[PDB]
Short mmCIF file of C-alpha atoms in Angstrom, two decimals:
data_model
loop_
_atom_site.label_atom_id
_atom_site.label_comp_id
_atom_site.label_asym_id
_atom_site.label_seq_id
_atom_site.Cartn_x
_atom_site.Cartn_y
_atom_site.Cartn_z
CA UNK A 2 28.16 39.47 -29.23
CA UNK A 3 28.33 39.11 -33.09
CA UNK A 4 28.80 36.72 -35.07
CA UNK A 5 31.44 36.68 -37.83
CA UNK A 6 31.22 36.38 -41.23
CA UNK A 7 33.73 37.02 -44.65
CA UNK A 8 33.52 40.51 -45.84
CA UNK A 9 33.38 39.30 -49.25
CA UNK A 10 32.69 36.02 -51.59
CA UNK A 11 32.87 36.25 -55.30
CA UNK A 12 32.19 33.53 -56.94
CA UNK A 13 30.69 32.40 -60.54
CA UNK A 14 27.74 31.74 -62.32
CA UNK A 15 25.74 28.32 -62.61
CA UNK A 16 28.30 27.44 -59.28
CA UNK A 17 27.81 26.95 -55.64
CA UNK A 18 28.64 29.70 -53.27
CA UNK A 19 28.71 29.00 -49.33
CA UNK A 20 28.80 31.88 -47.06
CA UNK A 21 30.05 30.80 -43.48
CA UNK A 22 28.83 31.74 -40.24
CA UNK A 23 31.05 31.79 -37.30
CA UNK A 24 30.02 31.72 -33.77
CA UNK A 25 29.93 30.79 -30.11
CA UNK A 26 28.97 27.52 -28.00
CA UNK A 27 26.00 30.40 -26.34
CA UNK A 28 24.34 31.73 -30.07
CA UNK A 29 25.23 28.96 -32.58
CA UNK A 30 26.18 25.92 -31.08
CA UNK A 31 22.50 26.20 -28.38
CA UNK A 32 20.34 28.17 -30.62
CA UNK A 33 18.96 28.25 -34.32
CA UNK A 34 20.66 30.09 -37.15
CA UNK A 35 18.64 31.95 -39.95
CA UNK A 36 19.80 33.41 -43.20
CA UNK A 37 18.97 36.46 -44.66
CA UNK A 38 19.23 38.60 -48.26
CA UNK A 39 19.78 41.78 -48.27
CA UNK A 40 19.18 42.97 -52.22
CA UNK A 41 21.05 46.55 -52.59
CA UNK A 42 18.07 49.27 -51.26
CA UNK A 43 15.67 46.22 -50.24
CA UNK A 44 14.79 45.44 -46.70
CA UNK A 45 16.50 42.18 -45.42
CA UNK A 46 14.53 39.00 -46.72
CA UNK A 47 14.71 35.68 -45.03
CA UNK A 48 15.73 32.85 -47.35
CA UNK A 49 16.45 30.31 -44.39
CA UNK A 50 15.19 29.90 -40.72
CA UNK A 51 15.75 26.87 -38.00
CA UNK A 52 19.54 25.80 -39.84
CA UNK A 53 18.01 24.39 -42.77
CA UNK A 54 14.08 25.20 -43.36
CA UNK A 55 13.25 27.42 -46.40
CA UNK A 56 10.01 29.88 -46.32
CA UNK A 57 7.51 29.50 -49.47
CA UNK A 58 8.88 31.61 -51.90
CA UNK A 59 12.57 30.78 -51.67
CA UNK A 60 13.80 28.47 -54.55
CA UNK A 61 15.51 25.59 -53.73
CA UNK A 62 18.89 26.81 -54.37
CA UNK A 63 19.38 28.53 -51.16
CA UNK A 64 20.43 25.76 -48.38
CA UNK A 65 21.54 25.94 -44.69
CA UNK A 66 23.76 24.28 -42.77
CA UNK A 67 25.10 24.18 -39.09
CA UNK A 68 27.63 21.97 -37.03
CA UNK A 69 28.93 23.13 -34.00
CA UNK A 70 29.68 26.50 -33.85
CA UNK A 71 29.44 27.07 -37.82
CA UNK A 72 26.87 27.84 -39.80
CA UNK A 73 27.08 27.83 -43.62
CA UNK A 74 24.54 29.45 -46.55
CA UNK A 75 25.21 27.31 -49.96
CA UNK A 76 23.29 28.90 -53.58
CA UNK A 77 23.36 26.27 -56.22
CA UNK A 78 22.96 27.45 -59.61
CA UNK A 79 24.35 31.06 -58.78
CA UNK A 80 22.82 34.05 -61.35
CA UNK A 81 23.52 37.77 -61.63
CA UNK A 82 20.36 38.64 -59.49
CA UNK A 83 22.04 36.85 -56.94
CA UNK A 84 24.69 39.85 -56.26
CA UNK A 85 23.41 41.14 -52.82
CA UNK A 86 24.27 41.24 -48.55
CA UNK A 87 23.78 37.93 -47.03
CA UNK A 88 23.44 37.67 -43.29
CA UNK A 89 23.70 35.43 -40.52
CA UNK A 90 21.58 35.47 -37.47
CA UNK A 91 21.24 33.69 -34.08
CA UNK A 92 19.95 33.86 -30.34
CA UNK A 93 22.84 34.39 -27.76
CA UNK A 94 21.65 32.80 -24.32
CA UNK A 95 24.53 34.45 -22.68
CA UNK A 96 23.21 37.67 -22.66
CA UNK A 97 19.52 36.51 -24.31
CA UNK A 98 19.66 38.79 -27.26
CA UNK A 99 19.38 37.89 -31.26
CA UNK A 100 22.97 38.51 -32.78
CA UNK A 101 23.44 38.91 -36.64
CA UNK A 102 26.65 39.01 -38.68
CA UNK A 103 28.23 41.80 -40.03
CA UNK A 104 27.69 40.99 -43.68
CA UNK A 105 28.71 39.44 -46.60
CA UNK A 106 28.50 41.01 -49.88
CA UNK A 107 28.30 38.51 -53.38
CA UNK A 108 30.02 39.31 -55.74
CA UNK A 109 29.21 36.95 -59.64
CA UNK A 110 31.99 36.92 -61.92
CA UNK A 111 31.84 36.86 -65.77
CA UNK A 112 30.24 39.97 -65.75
CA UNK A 113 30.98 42.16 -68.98
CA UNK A 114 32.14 45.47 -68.51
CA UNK A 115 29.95 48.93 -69.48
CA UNK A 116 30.91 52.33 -70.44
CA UNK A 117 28.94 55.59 -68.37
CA UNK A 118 26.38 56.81 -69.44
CA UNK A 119 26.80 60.51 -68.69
CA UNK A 120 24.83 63.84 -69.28
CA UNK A 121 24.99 67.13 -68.65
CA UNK A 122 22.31 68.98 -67.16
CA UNK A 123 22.54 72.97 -67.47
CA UNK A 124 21.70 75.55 -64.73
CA UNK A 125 18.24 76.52 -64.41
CA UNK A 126 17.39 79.92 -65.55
CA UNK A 127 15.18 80.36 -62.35
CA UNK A 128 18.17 79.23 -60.77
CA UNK A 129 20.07 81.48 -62.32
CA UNK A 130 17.37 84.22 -61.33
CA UNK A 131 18.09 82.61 -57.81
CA UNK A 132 22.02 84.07 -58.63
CA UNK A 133 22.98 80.48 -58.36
CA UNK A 134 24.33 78.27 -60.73
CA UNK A 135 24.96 74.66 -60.74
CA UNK A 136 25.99 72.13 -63.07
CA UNK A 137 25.05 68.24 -62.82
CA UNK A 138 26.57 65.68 -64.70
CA UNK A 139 24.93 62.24 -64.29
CA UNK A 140 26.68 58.83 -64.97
CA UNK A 141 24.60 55.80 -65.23
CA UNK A 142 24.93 51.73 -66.03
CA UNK A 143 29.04 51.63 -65.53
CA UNK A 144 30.22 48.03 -64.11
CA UNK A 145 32.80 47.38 -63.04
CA UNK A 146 31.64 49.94 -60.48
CA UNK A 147 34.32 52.57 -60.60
CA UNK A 148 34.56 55.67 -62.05
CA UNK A 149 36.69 59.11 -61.77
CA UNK A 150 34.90 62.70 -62.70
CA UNK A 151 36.89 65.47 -64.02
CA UNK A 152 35.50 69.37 -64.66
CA UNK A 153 36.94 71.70 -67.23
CA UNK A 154 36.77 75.19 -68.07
CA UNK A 155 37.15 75.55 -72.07
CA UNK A 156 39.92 73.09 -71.12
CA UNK A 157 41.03 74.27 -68.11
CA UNK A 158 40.88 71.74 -65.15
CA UNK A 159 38.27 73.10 -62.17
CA UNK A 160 38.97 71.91 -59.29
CA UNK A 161 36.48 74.00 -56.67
CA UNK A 162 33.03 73.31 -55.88
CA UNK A 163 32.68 70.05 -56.97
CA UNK A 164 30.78 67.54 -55.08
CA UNK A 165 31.11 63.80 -56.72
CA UNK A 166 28.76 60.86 -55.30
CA UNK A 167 30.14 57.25 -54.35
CA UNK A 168 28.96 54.64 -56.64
CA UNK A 169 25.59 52.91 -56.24
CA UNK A 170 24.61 49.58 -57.14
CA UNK A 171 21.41 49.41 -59.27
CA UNK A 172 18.65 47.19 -59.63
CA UNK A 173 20.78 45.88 -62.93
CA UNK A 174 23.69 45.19 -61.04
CA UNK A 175 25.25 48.37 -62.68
CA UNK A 176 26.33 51.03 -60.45
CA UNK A 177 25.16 54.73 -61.13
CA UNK A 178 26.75 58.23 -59.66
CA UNK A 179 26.61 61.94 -60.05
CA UNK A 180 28.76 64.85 -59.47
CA UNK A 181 27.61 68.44 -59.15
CA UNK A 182 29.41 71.59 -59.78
CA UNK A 183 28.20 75.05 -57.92
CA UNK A 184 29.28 77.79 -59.95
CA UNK A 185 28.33 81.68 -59.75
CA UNK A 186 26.65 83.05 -63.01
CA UNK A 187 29.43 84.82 -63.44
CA UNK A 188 31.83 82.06 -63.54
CA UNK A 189 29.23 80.75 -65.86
CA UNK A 190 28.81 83.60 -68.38
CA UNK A 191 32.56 84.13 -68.22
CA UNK A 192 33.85 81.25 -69.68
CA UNK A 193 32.27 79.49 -73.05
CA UNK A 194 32.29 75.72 -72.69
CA UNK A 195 31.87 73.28 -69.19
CA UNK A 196 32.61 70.08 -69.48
CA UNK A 197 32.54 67.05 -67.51
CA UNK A 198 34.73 63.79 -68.12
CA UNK A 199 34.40 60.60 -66.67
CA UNK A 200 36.63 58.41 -66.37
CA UNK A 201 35.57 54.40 -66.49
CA UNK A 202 38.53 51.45 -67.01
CA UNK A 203 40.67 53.55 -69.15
CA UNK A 204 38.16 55.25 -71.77
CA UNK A 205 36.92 58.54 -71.32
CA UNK A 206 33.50 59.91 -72.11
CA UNK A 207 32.97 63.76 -71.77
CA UNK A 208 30.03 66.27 -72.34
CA UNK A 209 29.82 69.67 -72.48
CA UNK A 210 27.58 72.99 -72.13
CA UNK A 211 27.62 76.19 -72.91
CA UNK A 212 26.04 79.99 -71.51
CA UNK B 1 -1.73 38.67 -46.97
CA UNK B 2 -0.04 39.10 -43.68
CA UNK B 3 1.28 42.69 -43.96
CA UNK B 4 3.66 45.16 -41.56
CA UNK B 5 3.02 48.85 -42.29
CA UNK B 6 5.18 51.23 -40.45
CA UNK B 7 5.19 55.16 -39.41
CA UNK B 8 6.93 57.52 -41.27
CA UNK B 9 10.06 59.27 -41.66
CA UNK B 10 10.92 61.20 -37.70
CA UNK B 11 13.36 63.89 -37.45
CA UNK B 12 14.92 64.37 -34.20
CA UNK B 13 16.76 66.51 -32.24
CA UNK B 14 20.04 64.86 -30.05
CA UNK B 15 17.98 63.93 -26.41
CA UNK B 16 14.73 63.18 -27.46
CA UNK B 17 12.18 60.55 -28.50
CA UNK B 18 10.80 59.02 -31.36
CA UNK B 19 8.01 56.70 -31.32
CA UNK B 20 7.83 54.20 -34.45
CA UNK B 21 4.57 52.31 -34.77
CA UNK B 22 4.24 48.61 -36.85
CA UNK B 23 0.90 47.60 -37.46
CA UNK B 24 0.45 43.90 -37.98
CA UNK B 25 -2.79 42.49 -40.39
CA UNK B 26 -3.73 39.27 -41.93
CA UNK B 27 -3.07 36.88 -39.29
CA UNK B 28 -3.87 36.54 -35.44
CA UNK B 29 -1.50 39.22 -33.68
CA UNK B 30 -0.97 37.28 -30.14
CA UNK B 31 0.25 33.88 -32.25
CA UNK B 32 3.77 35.61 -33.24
CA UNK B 33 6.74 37.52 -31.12
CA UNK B 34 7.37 40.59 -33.24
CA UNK B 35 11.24 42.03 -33.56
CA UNK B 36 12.60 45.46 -33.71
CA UNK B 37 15.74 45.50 -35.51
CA UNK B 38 17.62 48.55 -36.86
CA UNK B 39 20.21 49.57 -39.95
CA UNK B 40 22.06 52.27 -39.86
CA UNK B 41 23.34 54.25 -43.44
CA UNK B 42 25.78 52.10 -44.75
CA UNK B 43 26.25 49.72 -41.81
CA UNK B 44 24.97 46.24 -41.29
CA UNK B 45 21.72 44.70 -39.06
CA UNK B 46 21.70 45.49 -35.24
CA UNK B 47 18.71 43.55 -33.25
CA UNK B 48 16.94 46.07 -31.02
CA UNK B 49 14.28 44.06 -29.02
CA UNK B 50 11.45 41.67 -29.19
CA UNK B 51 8.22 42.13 -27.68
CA UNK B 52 5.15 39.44 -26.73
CA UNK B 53 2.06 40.52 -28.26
CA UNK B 54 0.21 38.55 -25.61
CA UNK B 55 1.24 40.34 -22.53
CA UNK B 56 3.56 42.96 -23.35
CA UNK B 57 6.70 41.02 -22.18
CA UNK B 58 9.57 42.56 -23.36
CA UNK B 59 13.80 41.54 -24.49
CA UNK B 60 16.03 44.57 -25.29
CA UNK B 61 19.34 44.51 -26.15
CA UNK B 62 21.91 45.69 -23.70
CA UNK B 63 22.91 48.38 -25.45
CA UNK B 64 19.38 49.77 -25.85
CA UNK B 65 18.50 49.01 -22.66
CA UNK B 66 19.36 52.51 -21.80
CA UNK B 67 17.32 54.11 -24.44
CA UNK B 68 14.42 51.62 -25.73
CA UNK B 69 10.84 50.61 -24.42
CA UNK B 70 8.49 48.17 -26.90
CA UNK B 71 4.35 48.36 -26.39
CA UNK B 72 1.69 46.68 -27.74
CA UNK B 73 -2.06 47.62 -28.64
CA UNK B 74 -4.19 44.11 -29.10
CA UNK B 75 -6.89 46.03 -30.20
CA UNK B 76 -5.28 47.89 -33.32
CA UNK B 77 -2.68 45.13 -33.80
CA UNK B 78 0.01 47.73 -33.20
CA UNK B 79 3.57 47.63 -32.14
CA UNK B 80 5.25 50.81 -30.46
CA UNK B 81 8.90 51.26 -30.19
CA UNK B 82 10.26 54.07 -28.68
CA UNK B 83 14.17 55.23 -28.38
CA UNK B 84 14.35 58.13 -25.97
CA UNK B 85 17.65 59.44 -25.26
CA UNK B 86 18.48 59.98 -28.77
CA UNK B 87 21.96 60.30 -29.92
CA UNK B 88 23.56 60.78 -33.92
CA UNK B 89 24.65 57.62 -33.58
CA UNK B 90 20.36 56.10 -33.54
CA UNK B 91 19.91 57.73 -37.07
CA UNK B 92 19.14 54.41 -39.07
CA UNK B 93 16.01 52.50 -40.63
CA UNK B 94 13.81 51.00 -38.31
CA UNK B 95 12.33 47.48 -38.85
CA UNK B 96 9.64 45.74 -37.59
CA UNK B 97 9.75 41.87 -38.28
CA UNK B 98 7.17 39.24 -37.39
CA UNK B 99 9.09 36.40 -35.61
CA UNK B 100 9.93 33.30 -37.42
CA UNK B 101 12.80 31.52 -34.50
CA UNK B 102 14.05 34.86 -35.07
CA UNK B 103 13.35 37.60 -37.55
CA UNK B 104 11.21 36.38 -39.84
CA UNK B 105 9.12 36.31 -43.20
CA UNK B 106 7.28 39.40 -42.71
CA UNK B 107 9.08 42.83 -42.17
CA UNK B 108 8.22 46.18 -42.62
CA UNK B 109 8.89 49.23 -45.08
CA UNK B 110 11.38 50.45 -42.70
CA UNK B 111 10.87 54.27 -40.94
CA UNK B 112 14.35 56.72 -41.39
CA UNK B 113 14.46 58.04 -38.21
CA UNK B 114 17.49 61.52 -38.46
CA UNK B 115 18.72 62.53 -34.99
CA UNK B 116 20.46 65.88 -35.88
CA UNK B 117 20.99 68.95 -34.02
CA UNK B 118 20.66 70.97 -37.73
CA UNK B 119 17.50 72.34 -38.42
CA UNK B 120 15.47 70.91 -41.69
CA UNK B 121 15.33 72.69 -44.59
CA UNK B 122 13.26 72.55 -47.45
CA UNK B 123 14.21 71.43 -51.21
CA UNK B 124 14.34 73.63 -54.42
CA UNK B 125 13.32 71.78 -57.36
CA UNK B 126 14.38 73.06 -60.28
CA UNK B 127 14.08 71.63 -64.06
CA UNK B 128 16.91 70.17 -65.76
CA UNK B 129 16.03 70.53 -69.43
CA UNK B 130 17.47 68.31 -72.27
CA UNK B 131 19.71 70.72 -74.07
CA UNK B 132 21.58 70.44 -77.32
CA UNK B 133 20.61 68.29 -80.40
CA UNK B 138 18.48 58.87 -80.45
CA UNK B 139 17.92 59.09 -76.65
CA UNK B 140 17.92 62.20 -74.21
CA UNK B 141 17.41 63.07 -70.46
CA UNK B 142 15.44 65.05 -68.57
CA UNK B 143 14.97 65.50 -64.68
CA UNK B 144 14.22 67.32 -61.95
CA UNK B 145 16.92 68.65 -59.09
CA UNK B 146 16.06 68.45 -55.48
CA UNK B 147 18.73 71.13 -54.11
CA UNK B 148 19.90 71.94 -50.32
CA UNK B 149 17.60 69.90 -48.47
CA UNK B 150 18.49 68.28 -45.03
CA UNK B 151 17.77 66.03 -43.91
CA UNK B 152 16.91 62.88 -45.91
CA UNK B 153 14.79 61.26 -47.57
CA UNK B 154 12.88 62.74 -50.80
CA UNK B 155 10.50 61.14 -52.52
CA UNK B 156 10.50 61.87 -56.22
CA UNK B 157 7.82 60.71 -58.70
CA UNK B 158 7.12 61.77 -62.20
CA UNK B 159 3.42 62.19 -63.47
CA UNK B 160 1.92 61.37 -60.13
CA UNK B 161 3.21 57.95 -60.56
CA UNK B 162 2.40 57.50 -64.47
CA UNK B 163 5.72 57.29 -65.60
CA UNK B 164 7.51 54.50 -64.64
CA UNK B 165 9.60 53.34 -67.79
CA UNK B 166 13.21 55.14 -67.88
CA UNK B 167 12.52 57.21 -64.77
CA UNK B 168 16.58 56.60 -62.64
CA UNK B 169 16.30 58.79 -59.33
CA UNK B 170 19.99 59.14 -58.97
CA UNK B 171 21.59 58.74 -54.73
CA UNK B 172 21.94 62.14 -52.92
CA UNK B 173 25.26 63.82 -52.36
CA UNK B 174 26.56 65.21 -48.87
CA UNK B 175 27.78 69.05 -49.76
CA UNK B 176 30.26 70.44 -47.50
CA UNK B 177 27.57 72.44 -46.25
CA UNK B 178 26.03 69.36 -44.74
CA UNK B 179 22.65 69.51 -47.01
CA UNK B 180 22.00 67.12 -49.52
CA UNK B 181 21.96 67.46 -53.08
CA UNK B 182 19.88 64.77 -55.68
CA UNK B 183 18.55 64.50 -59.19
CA UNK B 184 15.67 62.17 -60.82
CA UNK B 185 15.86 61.94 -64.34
CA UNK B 186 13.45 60.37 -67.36
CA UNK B 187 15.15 58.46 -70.32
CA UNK B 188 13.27 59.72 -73.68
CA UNK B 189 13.77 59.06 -76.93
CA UNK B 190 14.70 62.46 -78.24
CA UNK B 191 12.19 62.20 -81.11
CA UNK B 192 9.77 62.89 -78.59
CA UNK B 193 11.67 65.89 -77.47
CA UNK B 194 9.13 69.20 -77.45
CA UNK B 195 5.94 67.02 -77.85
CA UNK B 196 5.25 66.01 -73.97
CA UNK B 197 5.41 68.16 -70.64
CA UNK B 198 6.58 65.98 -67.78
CA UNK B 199 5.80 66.45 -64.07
CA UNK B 200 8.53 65.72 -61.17
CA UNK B 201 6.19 65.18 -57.96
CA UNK B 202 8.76 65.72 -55.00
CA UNK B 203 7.80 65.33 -51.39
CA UNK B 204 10.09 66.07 -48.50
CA UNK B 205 8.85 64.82 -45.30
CA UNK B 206 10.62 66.61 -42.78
CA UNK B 207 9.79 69.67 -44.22
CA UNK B 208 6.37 69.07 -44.99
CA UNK B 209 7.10 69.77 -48.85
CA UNK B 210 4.82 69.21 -51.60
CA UNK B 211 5.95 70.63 -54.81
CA UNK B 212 5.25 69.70 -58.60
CA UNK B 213 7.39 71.42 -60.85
CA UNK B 214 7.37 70.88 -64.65
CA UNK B 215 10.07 69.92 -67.09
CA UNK B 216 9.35 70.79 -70.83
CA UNK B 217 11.47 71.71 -73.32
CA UNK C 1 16.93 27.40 -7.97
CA UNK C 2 13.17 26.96 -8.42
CA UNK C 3 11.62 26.27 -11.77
CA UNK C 4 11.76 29.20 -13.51
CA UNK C 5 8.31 32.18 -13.53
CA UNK C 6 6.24 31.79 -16.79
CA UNK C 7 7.02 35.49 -16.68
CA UNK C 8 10.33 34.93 -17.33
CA UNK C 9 10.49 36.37 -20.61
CA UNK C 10 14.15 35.54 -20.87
CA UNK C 11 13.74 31.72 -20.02
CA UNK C 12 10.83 31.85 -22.45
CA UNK C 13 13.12 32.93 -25.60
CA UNK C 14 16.48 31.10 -24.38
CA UNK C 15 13.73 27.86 -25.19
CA UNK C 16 11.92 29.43 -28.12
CA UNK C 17 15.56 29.97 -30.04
CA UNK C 18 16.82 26.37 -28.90
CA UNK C 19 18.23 23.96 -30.90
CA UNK C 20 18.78 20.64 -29.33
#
């Protein structure tokens, strides 16, 4: 029992954005629907309860709606801080259990476009008195929210022993990743320059280290 | 100030039982139905049960109602979930809500509970040092550690102003890999020591290590 | 049919979450 929702609204600033809810006759079309937000590594916050009633805190731009077996979520005025997982929720009588949606992630447009911020982190000496080596290359603030990491070995591509990170959304609305190459000293000592490139809309940015 | 504090992160092996308190404070605990309602890692919000403060009457969803039982301690203003039976597929955050025609205003931290047949393992925080020769990074790595979370602070919880503790990454291996860095301006390079404060739960690891130049 | 138990925690919540 689950109510459906779209997997994805993008829409653009100082607009309206409506969300829609999609039940049954037993959860939405009997029982009250509540709306929830979902900020990315936040625990859900309610922004509407009872189809239309807004708890203090919640600015008026959030609204609710139901008819039938619909429900709707409407933000006037829409900003950047917006951008997060909006949910639906009801009470199913048929079974008599509380059924949320599966999600629907915001998306604001207009939003200008960033390069990575990467660096390159060394191995440890008392990791490399551990006879381990490892490499870390962190990229930071890059929207849109792809990127691609490359390694090289004074030039040559290395392809082994990397471990890359899916993007992350930030508290920015930037997205943030990291990629980590395990190397043995000796593969360290033996060559003379490690480099990491990453790869964001076209333009490359790469760093490097050296033994 | 009507506040839900919840246990900590639990670490379980596949058949057995974690218990996950919520205490309740700042308003009467018998006027409001609290919810349980879980999230697992990179999925969306399942709704476990709801319980009665009054008399311990209890709703579980069907698919729980295998594996879930909801208590209630009027004295202590405490909720108690438990999930016996545990499978990988109960490895989420754990929510407590207070009940508002449905989940409400007032939820709780959340509690990671890990149902995994691997053993835990501690971290190995090692310095990640600046470099070559404005703005510059330094950090702190949190290596082979399973399972999640770490908790990484710098300073004891000083430094707050360009500290970015970067997501974890799975290794092959199946332990997880992450790094917490600080954003300095690299005039100030040599002249302060900085402290990464990591804590590992599961492991019951404590360990300051320091980053200077 | 009888009217239902005020035990019946089920009855209880299908009323609580109603909406007219």
């Amino acid at each position: 029992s689950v109510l459906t929702q779209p997997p994805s609204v993008s829409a653009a600033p100082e607009r309206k954005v409506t969300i829609s809810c999609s039940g049954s006759s037993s959860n939405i079309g009997t029982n009250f629907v509540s709306w929830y937000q979902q900020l990315p590594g936040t625990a859900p916050k309610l922004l509407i309860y009872e189809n239309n009633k807004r708890p203090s805190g919640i600015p008026d731009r959030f609204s609710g709606s139901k008819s039938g077996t619909s429900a709707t979520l409407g933000i006037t005025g829409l900003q950047t801080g917006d951008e997060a997982d909006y949910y639906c929720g009801a009470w199913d009588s048929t079974p008599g259990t509380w059924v949320f949606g599966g999600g629907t992630r915001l998306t604001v447009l207009g939003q200008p476009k960033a390069a990575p911020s990467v660096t390159l982190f060394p191995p440890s000496s008392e990791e490399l008195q551990a006879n381990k080596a490892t490499l870390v290359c962190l990229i930071s603030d890059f929207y849109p929210g792809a990127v691609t990491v490359a390694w090289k070995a004074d030039s040559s591509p290395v392809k082994a022993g990397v471990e890359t990170t899916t993007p992350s959304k930030q508290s920015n609305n930037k997205y943030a990743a990291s990629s980590y190459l395990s190397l043995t000293p000796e593969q360290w000592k033996s060559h003379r320059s490690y480099s990491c490139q990453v790869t964001h809309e076209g333009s490359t940015v790469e760093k490097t280290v050296a033994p | 100030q009507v506040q839900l504090v919840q246990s900590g992160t639990e670490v379980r092996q596949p058949g057995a039982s974690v218990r996950v308190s919520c205490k309740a404070s700042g308003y009467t605990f018998t006027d409001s139905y609290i919810h349980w309602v879980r999230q697992a890692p990179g999925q969306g919000l399942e709704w476990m049960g709801i319980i009665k403060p009054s008399g311990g009457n209890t709703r579980y969803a069907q698919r729980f109602q295998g594996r879930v039982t909801m208590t209630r301690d009027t004295s202590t203003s405490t909720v108690y979930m438990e999930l016996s039976s545990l499978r990988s597929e109960d490895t989420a955050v754990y929510y407590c809500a207070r009940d508002s025609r449905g989940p409400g205003i007032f939820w709780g931290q959340g509690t990671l509970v890990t149902v995994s047949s691997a053993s835990t393992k501690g971290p190995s925080v090692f310095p990640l040092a600046p470099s070559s020769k404005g703005t510059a990074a330094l950090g702190c790595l949190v290596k082979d550690y399973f399972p999640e979370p770490v908790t990484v602070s710098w300073n004891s919880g000083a430094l707050t102003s360009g500290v970015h503790t970067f997501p974890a990454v799975l290794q092959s291996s199946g332990l997880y890999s992450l790094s917490s860095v600080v954003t300095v301006p690299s005039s100030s390079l040599g002249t302060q020591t900085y402290i990464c404060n990591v804590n590992h739960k599961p492991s019951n690891t404590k360990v300051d290590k320091r980053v200077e130049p | 049919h009888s009217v239902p138990k005020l035990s019946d925690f089920e009855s209880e919540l299908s009323h609580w979450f109603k909406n007219q």
